[PDB]
Amino acid sequence: GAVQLHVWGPAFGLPSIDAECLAAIAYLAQTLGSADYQLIQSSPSAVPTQHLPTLYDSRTSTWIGGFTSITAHLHTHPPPTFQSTAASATADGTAYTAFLSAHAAPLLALSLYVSSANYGAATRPAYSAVLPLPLPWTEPPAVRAAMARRAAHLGLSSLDADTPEQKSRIRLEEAAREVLDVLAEVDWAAGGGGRQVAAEVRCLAFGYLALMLLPDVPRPWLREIMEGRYPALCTFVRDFRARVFPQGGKLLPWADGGAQASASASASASAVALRFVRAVMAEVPLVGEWWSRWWTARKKREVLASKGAKPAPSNDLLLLLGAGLGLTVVGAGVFFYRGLPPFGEAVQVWRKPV
Amino acid sequence: LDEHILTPASISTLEVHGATNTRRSLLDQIFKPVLEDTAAAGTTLGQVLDRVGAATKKLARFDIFKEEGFGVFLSEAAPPQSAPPTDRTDLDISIRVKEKSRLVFSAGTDFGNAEGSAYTNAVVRNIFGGAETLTVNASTGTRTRSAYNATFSTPINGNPDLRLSVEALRSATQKPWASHEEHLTGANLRLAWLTEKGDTHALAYSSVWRQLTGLAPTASPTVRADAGDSLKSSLTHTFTRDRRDNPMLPQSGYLFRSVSELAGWGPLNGDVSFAKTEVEASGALPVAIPGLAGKSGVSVGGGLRLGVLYPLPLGYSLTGAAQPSRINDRFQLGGPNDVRGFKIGGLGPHDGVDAVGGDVFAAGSVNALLPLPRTGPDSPLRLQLYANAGRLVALNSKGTDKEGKEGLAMDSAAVFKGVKSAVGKLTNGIPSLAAGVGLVYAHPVARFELNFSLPLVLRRGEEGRKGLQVGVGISFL
Amino acid sequence: IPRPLQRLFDYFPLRIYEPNELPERSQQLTSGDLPTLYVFSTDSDARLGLPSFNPGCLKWQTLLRLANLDFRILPSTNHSSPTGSLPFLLPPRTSPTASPAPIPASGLLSFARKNPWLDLGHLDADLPPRAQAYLALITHSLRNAWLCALYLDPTHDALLRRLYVDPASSSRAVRAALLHQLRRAAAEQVATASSGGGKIVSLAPVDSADGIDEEAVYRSARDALDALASLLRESETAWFFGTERPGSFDAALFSYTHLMVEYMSEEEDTESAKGRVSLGRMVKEAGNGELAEHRERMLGVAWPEWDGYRR
Ligand SMILES: CC(C)[C@@H](C)/C=C/[C@@H](C)[C@H]1CC[C@H]2C3=CC=C4C[C@@H](O)CC[C@]4(C)[C@H]3CC[C@]12C
Ligand SMILES: CC(C)[C@@H](C)/C=C/[C@@H](C)[C@H]1CC[C@H]2C3=CC=C4C[C@@H](O)CC[C@]4(C)[C@H]3CC[C@]12C
Ligand SMILES: CC(C)[C@@H](C)/C=C/[C@@H](C)[C@H]1CC[C@H]2C3=CC=C4C[C@@H](O)CC[C@]4(C)[C@H]3CC[C@]12C
Ligand SMILES: CC(C)[C@@H](C)/C=C/[C@@H](C)[C@H]1CC[C@H]2C3=CC=C4C[C@@H](O)CC[C@]4(C)[C@H]3CC[C@]12C
Ligand SMILES: CC(C)[C@@H](C)/C=C/[C@@H](C)[C@H]1CC[C@H]2C3=CC=C4C[C@@H](O)CC[C@]4(C)[C@H]3CC[C@]12C
Ligand SMILES: CC(C)[C@@H](C)/C=C/[C@@H](C)[C@H]1CC[C@H]2C3=CC=C4C[C@@H](O)CC[C@]4(C)[C@H]3CC[C@]12C
Ligand SMILES: CC(C)[C@@H](C)/C=C/[C@@H](C)[C@H]1CC[C@H]2C3=CC=C4C[C@@H](O)CC[C@]4(C)[C@H]3CC[C@]12C
């Protein structure tokens, strides 16, 4: 286990529920050996990068977050068991990676998270089934809010995701087509003809299309559109799944011999309590945003130090002593005020002048 | 009694009850002058009683005591002083007063509902036992721009007349007439002062950050050009002489109000530099029909308001290039509390539908309150006929030639010529005039008025209302 | 009931005068004989119609200049836009107190077609799907890199202040507040990106430079620049997709490359200290200078009179 990949738990008969995490899992399975990496089910609060998927290079103890960063790092520092118009192919791969991460993610967010019916039936149970007990009340809400913000530019809402209803279906179909037509020009099957893209691009495309197609939802507008209109993409997704993750991807080297047991290392009682507490203080109406900013800065400094940079020393001691001084001043003032004898008397009398 | 006021008396002891949370120095500087006022020692029961009444009226000014709890007990002084110079010369009075609640906190909260509407009203009062008052008026909307207000008031050297206030505010004013909204964020420093004659001076320093945002889709190019960020650090002086018998229903007397403001010039620093002054003069003359007796209720009132906005350079020099005024500072005319018969901001320059302001204005009014039949003159109801008129013009540099490639900068001569032309434009032509009848309600908290208007003369692009128009508030033309 | 009294309300008013003249500021700013495009620029630059320093305004200004529309530009702010964001166009006043409705960025090209100072299909033609995939690079990777380097980078603090907060107000407190909100907004946009972002910290979006991967954003920008250079190299002509005249794709790329070369192309001493190549240097070195020569050609086509465009 030279490198450890921290990803979400399995869902919808797939190794992971997140598109980027599934893409990273597929890339690792296709390139690295079975015993050269470990998969760890986790949540963003469990990793200092605060973002999944996250790779921890145990050879150097480096925290790398993001699918693109993980793929770039593994090319520069490959593990021992690594086996990955050339310029035009690289340019096409970069362009399609950017297009996927920029436009296919809002579509998946609209299908799974923005849609209230779909989120309340499959997505929320799937997220709650891969987290310890008190977490599903803090992390899935943040994930859903982030995905809704991602898909906000699409201009569609939960009501649209299903007579005005038939007008919304046209908008959904147009939004799906605007992405699927672009994605359909590439020969993701790596067969004869069509465009050619890198293995990383193919893995990312599968990661997005798998969550856009396979999950069974009460309102499968996206799955119906895909099956009806893009049989090539449906066949690519099915073949890639059946080739890379057979029997639901249970043969992957999950930590401690299982997906559920993998999370147990970082899901101790104290760790889960601390994560839940931090999530709670992050929502305080007054100091929540300041606490979140301080924690984010601390974790960013930790990640940079792990990478090898030399961040400026933190000024936490100065802030702590200033806050303590202010608290002591406030306490002294309130103690002076409390117990002060009344400023006047009940009766007040003035004698005649002398 | 009628004959009791002849006997001279002297105030021996002054006792005050129910002031357990008030500093001695507060009552010290007000009650000794009452105490030693018996120097005359002649028919004092006809003068010291009113003196004590004035003293308790001054006591009411502190706001820290309950009005319904003002008590004054009087009793002849039992000690038989040797050789009394006059009858019952020894006299003591007793004053009993109950303080208001020391902390009022009207936390109307709807935290469960999305629209919080948490109008916190911390009115912490009488801190340090010297009539210091701290007021917090924080509020929130439907997760929109939250309001914020915090005022701290304190009398100076325990003088209820001279009062110093510090305020920090954050509001969002809506301006439907000009198709935008103003976001205000700044602090003030006022020094109010009540003269013994009854006048009210008020010197205030304000440094607010204005923001024009939320433009309506029908916003005019002028409003679009004036949108952005601005800071106004100004020093303003307000003087009021209200001799009217009833401010809500002025039947006799007069009112003179002057609001002079200097912004940006000299030590003050900001994005706008001007000298704005407004003068308001009002009056009312009762008309008693000789046939009827007592207060007839018929009066012939009037009014007159003037205002000049003079652009000034930024710096310590009176001779320099000055920027033209912005829509934030320009005057607005028209409405029920203004020249009647016109829409709110219905007078002055109009860019399309937006009511942009002007630099000088001159409003006037001639009303005549009339009592309703089968109704006493003391009744707040009254019938009114008005003849409101007004003008509102904007400054421009048409007369000045050779503006230059660099614009929006007028020299002293250009600004003076523009001001002269703007003032001259008031004299030529009939002012925007409207007349109508209506009923006025003299509710003590605020005046209510509903009238049937009919515009007569107005400039093109101005808005007038020909139907029933209602008006509430305390300031009317 | 409406019929009888209407003969009385219509008689009034009795006298109507000519409308009051607009204020001096309104007469100086809103009066013009040409349509005015309101962009993020300076007073000196707007007089000569030089390119704006905001890429969003610069793209539309370049498209309008390629559309032959005779127009002028004036500095403005986001608060004055009908859609809450620059740029927008105000057609000339028909009357001294009346003006037509503002034209948003979406309707800019449609407006430019009705006033041919023609066949403007190339400026708004639908792109092929591969062209859309490549446009994703410009609209996400380059935009995120520009936003990060301009706002969240302390190196460009003086440039950001001079470009955005100094002309807004002369008050130090107001300038600081505006800078704080600008940085918050820019961090919020940058964080909504799979590369260099995507951190889950709370139910609120990330609004700080510490929740953003600057290295990932920079790497994505470099990859995007190389890919765009290769795509330009594919075309046989001097423009993208082998077109005879520049189009929407060329304008979109130019609106970022020109600004990067103009402002971010600083000295190599700063680059050597941190090992980070500046955005302008990356643009110049992408491919074999294809992006730099494309920017020069776009400048020679849309601003042929300008000559101080080097940096
Ligand atoms: C309301 C919030 C703010 C916080 C203070 C409340 C926390 C309590 C109510 C929650 C937090 C974690 C919860 C918790 C964690 C784990 C388990 C194990 C399970 O087998 C039985 C229930 C149990 C023991 C539950 C009970 C309820 C707890 C203790
Ligand atoms: C006993 C176990 C098995 C389960 C069924 C019980 C759950 C209830 C009793 C408890 C456990 C965790 C609690 C819980 C977790 C987290 C939060 C977030 C906080 O901002 C609001 C309250 C809220 C939503 C509370 C509500 C009460 C919950 C949901
Ligand atoms: C597998 C099991 C053994 C793991 C999950 C244990 C969970 C329990 C012991 C943890 C999970 C969440 C924790 C928890 C959540 C929130 C709070 C609120 C805080 O103000 C007091 C502690 C309290 C109440 C702690 C107590 C310990 C809890 C309940
Ligand atoms: C030690 C401190 C941190 C303890 C005593 C404070 C707890 C309070 C301030 C916390 C505990 C639970 C929190 C809480 C629970 C649930 C929600 C719902 C969410 O939609 C808005 C915030 C809100 C309403 C937050 C606000 C802050 C609360 C009320
Ligand atoms: C208080 C002392 C000084 C005495 C003299 C009071 C004088 C005031 C109240 C009187 C004196 C002259 C009066 C006066 C003069 C002329 C007019 C014009 C008329 O169309 C409206 C009433 C009005 C405006 C009245 C109002 C009341 C005034 C101003
Ligand atoms: C920006 C300008 C408009 C501000 C600073 C105006 C200041 C002047 C006009 C104010 C400031 C203090 C005022 C002042 C102080 C005290 C008194 C004593 C009183 O018995 C007569 C009036 C008089 C003399 C007034 C007149 C008006 C003054 C002199
Ligand atoms: C400003 C307030 C007080 C209102 C009531 C104005 C009143 C006066 C000044 C107004 C009302 C009626 C106006 C008036 C009526 C008719 C004419 C005939 C015209 O050929 C010359 C101007 C002239 C003579 C104007 C001058 C201004 C007058 C006299």
Ligand SMILES: CC(C)[C@@H](C)/C=C/[C@@H](C)[C@H]1CC[C@H]2C3=CC=C4C[C@@H](O)CC[C@]4(C)[C@H]3CC[C@]12C
């Ligand atoms: C009640 C008195 C005191 C005064 C104020 C009232 C004046 C109003 C009601 C009347 C008096 C004279 C009238 C008047 C005179 C002459 C003209 C010229 C005409 O071409 C337009 C209407 C106009 C301008 C009218 C408008 C209405 C006026 C101004």
Ligand SMILES: CC(C)[C@@H](C)/C=C\[C@@H](C)[C@H]1CC[C@H]2C3=CC=C4C[C@@H](O)CC[C@]4(C)[C@H]3CC[C@]12C
């Ligand atoms: C329509 C207007 C122009 C008519 C009614 C005329 C005057 C109005 C404005 C009234 C309002 C206040 C009045 C006013 C206030 C106080 C005094 C002091 C007194 O010793 C002389 C008269 C004088 C100066 C009067 C004159 C008339 C005034 C100025």
Ligand SMILES: CC(C)[C@@H](C)/C=C\[C@@H](C)[C@H]1CC[C@H]2C3=CC=C4C[C@@H](O)CC[C@]4(C)[C@H]3CC[C@]12C
């Ligand atoms: C020959 C040129 C240089 C002259 C006429 C120009 C300007 C100077 C000297 C004078 C002329 C008019 C003056 C002027 C007119 C009116 C007012 C309004 C008053 O509330 C503040 C002072 C102020 C603003 C002064 C300031 C000084 C000015 C502007």
Ligand SMILES: CC(C)[C@@H](C)/C=C\[C@@H](C)[C@H]1CC[C@H]2C3=CC=C4C[C@@H](O)CC[C@]4(C)[C@H]3CC[C@]12C
């Ligand atoms: C050539 C003449 C017939 C034209 C200019 C019309 C009117 C003349 C008589 C002028 C002379 C004085 C002017 C006049 C004096 C005072 C004011 C008070 C102000 O609140 C409104 C304007 C108003 C009422 C104007 C209106 C126009 C008047 C009455």
